[PDB]
Enzyme design. Sequence first.
Site, mmCIF file in Angstrom:
data_model
loop_
_atom_site.group_PDB
_atom_site.id
_atom_site.type_symbol
_atom_site.label_atom_id
_atom_site.label_comp_id
_atom_site.label_asym_id
_atom_site.label_seq_id
_atom_site.Cartn_x
_atom_site.Cartn_y
_atom_site.Cartn_z
ATOM 1 N N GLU A 1 2.868 7.104 -2.555
ATOM 2 C CA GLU A 1 2.686 8.465 -3.125
ATOM 3 C C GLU A 1 3.259 9.434 -2.078
ATOM 4 O O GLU A 1 2.607 10.368 -1.631
ATOM 5 C CB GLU A 1 1.194 8.749 -3.362
ATOM 6 C CG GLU A 1 0.394 7.627 -4.028
ATOM 7 C CD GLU A 1 -0.141 6.565 -3.060
ATOM 8 O OE1 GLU A 1 -0.902 5.683 -3.521
ATOM 9 O OE2 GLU A 1 0.170 6.615 -1.839
ATOM 10 N N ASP B 1 -9.222 3.672 -2.129
ATOM 11 C CA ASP B 1 -10.208 3.990 -1.103
ATOM 12 C C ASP B 1 -11.433 4.714 -1.608
ATOM 13 O O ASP B 1 -11.372 5.909 -1.903
ATOM 14 C CB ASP B 1 -9.516 4.803 0.002
ATOM 15 C CG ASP B 1 -8.319 4.062 0.639
ATOM 16 O OD1 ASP B 1 -8.259 2.814 0.573
ATOM 17 O OD2 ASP B 1 -7.436 4.746 1.240
ATOM 18 N N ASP C 1 0.830 -1.206 0.000
ATOM 19 C CA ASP C 1 0.000 0.000 0.000
ATOM 20 C C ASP C 1 0.878 1.276 0.000
ATOM 21 O O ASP C 1 2.059 1.243 0.300
ATOM 22 C CB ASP C 1 -0.820 -0.025 1.288
ATOM 23 C CG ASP C 1 -2.047 0.850 1.257
ATOM 24 O OD1 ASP C 1 -2.300 1.589 0.264
ATOM 25 O OD2 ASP C 1 -2.798 0.749 2.261
#
Length: 1058
Positions: free
Chosen positions: A536, A598, A533
């Site tokens: 960024e 998400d 995950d």
Amino acid sequence: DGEYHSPYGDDDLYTVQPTERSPRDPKAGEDVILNITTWPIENGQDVWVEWTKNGVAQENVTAAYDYNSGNNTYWKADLGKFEKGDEITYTTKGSTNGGTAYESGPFTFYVTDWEYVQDVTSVVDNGDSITLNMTATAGDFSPKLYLSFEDLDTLRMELSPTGKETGHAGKSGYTVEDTAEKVTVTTEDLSIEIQKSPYRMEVHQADGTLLTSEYTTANSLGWLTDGKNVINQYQNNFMTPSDEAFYGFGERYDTINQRGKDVETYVYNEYQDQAQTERTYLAVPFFVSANKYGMYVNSDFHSQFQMASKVEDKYSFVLDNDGDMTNMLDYYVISGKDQNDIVNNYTDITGKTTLLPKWAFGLWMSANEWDRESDVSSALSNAKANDIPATGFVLEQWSDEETYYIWNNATYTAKKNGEAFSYDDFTFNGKWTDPKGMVDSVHDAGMNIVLWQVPVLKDDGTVYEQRDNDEEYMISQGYSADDGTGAPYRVPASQWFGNGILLDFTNKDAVDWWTSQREYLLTEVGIDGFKTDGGEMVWGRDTTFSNGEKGQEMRNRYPTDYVSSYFDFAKSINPEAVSFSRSGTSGAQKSGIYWSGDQTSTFDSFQASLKAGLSASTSGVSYWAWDMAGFTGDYPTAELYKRATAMAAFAPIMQFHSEKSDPSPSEERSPWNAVARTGDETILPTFQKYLYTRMNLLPYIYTAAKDTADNGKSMMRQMAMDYPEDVNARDLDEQYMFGDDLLVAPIVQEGQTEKEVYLPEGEWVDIWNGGVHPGGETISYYADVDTLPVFAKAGAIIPMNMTDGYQLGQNVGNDLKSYDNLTFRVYPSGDSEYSFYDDVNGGEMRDISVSEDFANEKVSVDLPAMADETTMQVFSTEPTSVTIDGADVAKADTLDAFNEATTGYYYDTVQNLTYVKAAAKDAKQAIVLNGVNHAPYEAEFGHLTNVTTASHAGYTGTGFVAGFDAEKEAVEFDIDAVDGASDYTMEVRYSAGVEDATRTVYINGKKQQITLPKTANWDTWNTVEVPVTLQAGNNQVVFDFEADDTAGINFDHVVIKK
Ligand SMILES: [Mg+2]
Ligand SMILES: [Mg+2]
Ligand SMILES: [Mg+2]
Ligand SMILES: [Mg+2]
Ligand SMILES: [Mg+2]
Ligand SMILES: [Mg+2]
Ligand SMILES: [Mg+2]
Ligand SMILES: [Mg+2]
């Protein structure tokens, strides 16, 4: 007390810190403002700027107060405007009552302006490369544009504004025609036409068809420079007609066609409102146009694609650069045999998708709330109790939430100097008393497990011995990136994992250390991968990496270096390991599954997810997933859960997930929890139907996965990828192709039951019931909440793994090493072929060929050698005989009889499918179905007017149209000519036990009356043959009861034959 100014802040694309320089990189004629802060707020403060212009000291500039906030005062110093070439160096300072001055800097900027290519002065042909020597509109450079062929259908442009760099070699298979006014470069696939004065390029297909061309006024290609020290940006501009559509650009949530938008190639972690903000975790500087070309700008720097967003007939790219005058602009114009071939050529450049093991294509179960061994045992028992044979299992809330490589509650003696732990170093406690045992139970259930990870070392200021030890080691070894001043780079304080230290994935020694810490998870605990995950997380203009690259260049690349590092590492120890990630750029496709991030549990979010998957597909990211029905927000409604389940089962990767860490009641998006939360028990059988259907289709799905890896064809595709010329398919975002042959049309609107489906030319057959739909129009399909419109393309050959029941939606289990009944569903139409990837049997390629010859009432199948017994399900009327290698095989009267036979055939009257069973052989087998015609057009599936359907034995399909006995009633068919425009014979099967009947039939508006003689009784069906003339496309065939017609009829179907 202090002062602070930092010109670029965090160099965020979307926001600014309150102490930046504006503009960040000034161009000629732009007023330059410096925002400076001082603290605490006090009277008597002076803020000024000491600076030089071209090495000459200037008069100090005094800052003026702007506003106060908190403990600080904010000021603005105005340096004014500058000319191209000016080199400005400044230091900001603050002092109170003439005391101790605090300062920031020095900072330097070089003022730039644009220079563009003017004319081509000479062309040098080097055999494997062409150099275009050019003049510039301004400045003193001698630019060179290099042309080369990555392949004969893929052109590469490399621009050196100074002319000091040289382009790369490519294929030599081109010819050049050079004249005083123009140079034309030709290959068997492309014709590149270049006017020399002014320079202007047009790219055409070998036949002359225009693909792309630089903007009509020329001077399209440029660079932003101070004319000495730096090149800060590049640009090119192109002409685009009003109808051109632009697809891809990575994973986009707002729209699948970017025309009219400014598209930013910038990875970003945007929670829930990706569509509204137009942001994405996965950005790629590659697009595909429906005008039959792709364009790839080869650079990891941020770029902006202005797609007819400023001038209606112009598109442009503006690419950033770190100032280095030696970095050439490098881009490709990509052609190919079709749109999917374009994507393949792009993957030749940036990397092929890596085939994943078959387990990745079953259902993945996940829930953040799963955080202890009892949750795992319960999840496994619930799946079994509810007959959910999943293949993937994710744990997110599994670690100490400090080091992220140690199990929650585990105790151990902390280690210094970044030493790795082995399983035996731990005493497992509380939530995870036996991690290896827990993993063994997941494997025992036929599933594989992945563990959540991040690329950052947490640092929230709290004391925690092992994390503090690892931070010390990481810093001392230089395993972090550098902030630009010698200290470790940390994620900005306000962001996710703020203050944490990123692992420099460009540093091999850093990667080996980081992975060594997780090694025991693979070697001893036995996991099957990582859910990598984040990523960024690279900000800062001066942030520096081990490869010498800085923040601007590395932001987009970092997530892919991180994801690929873990993917490769995991796979080195466990060949079956799979990664599951969200962020990346070009090349992301080489390293596992990408999920859409998400989102909330709404229909709007479902719409955005579908756009994300379709744009990602065009961009070469085929193994794509989403959290079905959303992972957070209010629990999904039964309607959304059911609609999402259907689409998810027909998507590249199927996975459910949920955000909440410890909710009551449970937030699992599992089917059993969905029944519990909504109270709707019907959710379970609906989920089961779709999961079982996916597993029935696993052979077709996995062959598609292999085709992505080998030929660049994405598993799920937007309609214009397969039909770029079809104007109706350009903007479709609520249907798609799945594999090569299925058209899937999910219902993504709340409360919708009337679903529009655009059908391209051809003939499409509903895979659930055999309903036939001629292409070339938008149909309206009634889809209740449990129904998903899915259609097979004409000529499709679809491998399936079926039970002895032989219907879609029957549970075959989750065995990945054998087939139950390997079956090939066939929709005959001319000659079609299919290459099956028989992974169960060593991964052998099985080439199946079908030859439709309905004009002579035959359909032939050439079955190659197979390791297993095979069952063909051929869509047709009932055969008179079926031969295998010239010998007749026995007709089975029932499905039970068919299952008992070792060879034979059986006709399924409901589905209009002829089953043919062939034994396993080390040799080809020629199967021929005799006396067969195109499957019937069931009356019961036509367009009905003032009449309804009912179900007397002996009928085909689900029944027949009944109560057809009064004027104004009608049954209409959408009929296809079997072999083009021609006369045909239409069989009308009906029953008329009470009297002779007549109807008036209209064929494309042409009327005829037919007579249907009395039958023995209502249990005696009869067929009358009627001569008809059919043409290309959809033939409207209407059966009306008019003024002069008579008698009652039961109407079963019509068959079209020679
Ligand atoms: Mg190619
Ligand atoms: Mg829990
Ligand atoms: Mg293993
Ligand atoms: Mg270093
Ligand atoms: Mg819309
Ligand atoms: Mg033929
Ligand atoms: Mg059997
Ligand atoms: Mg029927």
